[PDB]
Structure formats: structure tokens, C-alpha cells
Amino acid sequence: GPMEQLKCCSGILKEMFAKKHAAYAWPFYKPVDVEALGLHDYCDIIKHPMDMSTIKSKLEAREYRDAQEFGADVRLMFSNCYKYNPPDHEVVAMARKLQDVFEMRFAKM
Ligand SMILES: O=c1cc(N2CCOCC2)oc2c(-c3ccc4c(c3)OCCO4)csc12
């Protein structure tokens, strides 16, 4: 059922926030801050920013109908990072490490 799916989405998001993953998860906790980080082209390139705290807020107000809408936002958060940055940049490697954790749990839901 859609309800149990979304309980499971909250548990996957919860694990993404856990200390175990903080070494590569920490950039994706909060919305990207273009002023504090000096990314003047960011809102030009990324038309739909996404982050873990926003996904948690959307979850906690059921904006997600099912697991697939949740997953689309998670992948959008990773896509933005892949789209915006050189593929060799540190933050891309970190997003990849976190996505491998997400996709494993998402597949086994
Ligand atoms: O796509 C991205 C591109 C980049 N950058 C910045 C540095 O390297 C060059 C370009 O930054 C981010 C971040 C991030 C980075 C640092 C933080 C942060 C968040 O939040 C808490 C304070 O420190 C998250 S996605 C992302």
C-alpha cells in the first residue's frame, strides 16, 4: 500500500541522515546556499533545487503520493549535483556514494 511505502521512504531518508553516512552525506542535508558558497550561476543551471531537509519536509506533509514521487526528488537532488559540477569534483564523488546507499535501500524496499 502507498502508506507503508511512505513509511519506508521516511526510514530510507532517516538512514541517509545517520552518522554512518555523514562523511559523504553532509553537503546534501540542507538546500544549496548560493550566497554563502558563491555559486552565481547555480540558479541559472539548476532550475529545481532539492535537498534532504526539503524532502523530509515534503514527506512530513504528504506531498509525495507514493514511493516513486519520493524517489524522483531524491534522484533530482543527485542529478542537480551531477549536472552542475565537473564530473571529477569531490562533491560528485560524495553524491555517488550517497546515491549507491539510496538506490540499494530503494530497490530492496
Ligand atoms: O552541486 C553542488 C556544488 C557545490 N560547490 C561548492 C564547492 O565546490 C565547488 C562547487 O556545492 C554543493 C553543496 C554544499 C557544499 C558545501 C557546504 C554545503 C553544501 O552545506 C553546508 C556548508 O558546506 C551541496 S550540492 C553542491
Curated annotation (Swiss-Prot):
<comment type="similarity">
    <text>Belongs to the BET family.</text>
</comment>
<comment type="function">
    <text>Chromatin reader protein that recognizes and binds acetylated histones and plays a key role in transmission of epigenetic memory across cell divisions and transcription regulation. Remains associated with acetylated chromatin throughout the entire cell cycle and provides epigenetic memory for postmitotic G1 gene transcription by preserving acetylated chromatin status and maintaining high-order chromatin structure. During interphase, plays a key role in regulating the transcription of signal-inducible genes by associating with the P-TEFb complex and recruiting it to promoters.</text>
</comment>
<feature type="site" description="Acetylated histone binding">
    <location>
        <position position="85"/>
    </location>
</feature>
<feature type="domain" description="Bromo 2">
    <location>
        <begin position="4"/>
        <end position="109"/>
    </location>
</feature>
<protein>
    <recommendedName>
        <fullName>Bromodomain-containing protein 4</fullName>
    </recommendedName>
</protein>
<comment type="subunit">
    <text>(Microbial infection) Interacts with bovine papillomavirus type 1 regulatory protein E2. This interactions may serve for the tethering of viral genomes to host mitotic chromosomes allowing successful partitioning of the viral genome during cell division.</text>
</comment>
<comment type="subunit">
    <text>Interacts with p53/TP53; the interaction is direct. Interacts (via CTD region) with CDK9 and CCNT1, acting as an associated component of P-TEFb complex. Interacts with RELA (when acetylated at 'Lys-310'). Interacts (via NET domain) with NSD3, CHD4, BICRA and ATAD5. The interaction with BICRA bridges BRD4 to the GBAF complex. Interacts (via NET domain) with JMJD6 (via JmjC and N-terminal domains); the interaction is stronger in presence of ssRNA and recruits JMJD6 on distal enhancers. Interacts with NSD3. Interacts with NIPBL.</text>
</comment>
